[PDB]
Design a binder for this molecule. Sequence first.
Ligand SMILES: COc1ccc(S(=O)(=O)N(CC(C)C)C[C@@H](O)[C@H](Cc2ccccc2)NC(=O)O[C@H]2[C@H]3CO[C@H]4OC[C@@H]2[C@H]4C3)cc1
Ligand SMILES: [Cl-]
Ligand SMILES: [Cl-]
Ligand code: NA
Lengths: 99, 99
Amino acid sequence: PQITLWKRPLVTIKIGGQLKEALLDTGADDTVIEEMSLPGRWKPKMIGGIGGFIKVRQYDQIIIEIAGHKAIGTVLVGPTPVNIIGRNLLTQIGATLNF
Amino acid sequence: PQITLWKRPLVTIKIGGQLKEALLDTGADDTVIEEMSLPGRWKPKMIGGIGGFIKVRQYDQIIIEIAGHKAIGTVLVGPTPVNIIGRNLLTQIGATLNF
Ligand SMILES: COc1ccc(S(=O)(=O)N(CC(C)C)C[C@@H](O)[C@H](Cc2ccccc2)NC(=O)O[C@H]2[C@H]3CO[C@H]4OC[C@@H]2[C@H]4C3)cc1
Ligand SMILES: [Cl-]
Ligand SMILES: [Cl-]
Ligand code: NA
């Protein structure tokens, strides 16, 4: 679709079998989801934003359904205040910015 | 133009007569730039990101060129790690997300 930006670009996602809302975020390199369990191995990572850094768990090869589009990639899980779909998965659904 | 997301969506902006690089950020409500001087009065604002909250200076009706497009609107100035163009100005240049 074409999403205007008058409001936050929130969409429904499916991850780990759970339905959530997430922000399509072109300013995020990586995808970051609020605390939840995912299967498989993970490793610790530190990521920084406005305010500073948080510790997260890095899970690789996770499948996510984004606005009904399937994608696979790394998902970071930790105390983010918002679920964020970042560029590593936006590319996989063919998302572009247009002006 | 049409901007894919395999790389960060960095563009050149011009503000207070200086050129800067900034991120086109659909995940940011507001535009936030690293510390610099701007004319006029400012007002206080606290904004929250991944790693907590920061105090910024809010300047209204500031002229800023973004990738060759004129915008005039609110700019937040503070200790952000990166210059971010948020939805308040992305709508002024006509930007949409497409997939
Ligand atoms: C390496 O992988 C990653 C992935 C994500 C991030 S990030 O989340 O720190 N960030 C990076 C960006 C360079 C600032 C993405 C933004 O798009 C956030 C996303 C985000 C939204 C809300 C809460 C936390 C993070 N925007 C936001 O801070 O905007 C505030 C400021 C912008 O204006 C408003 O809109 C959201 C809030 C608020 C003040 C960092 C590392
Ligand atoms: Cl990935
Ligand atoms: Cl592509
Ligand atoms: Na894995």
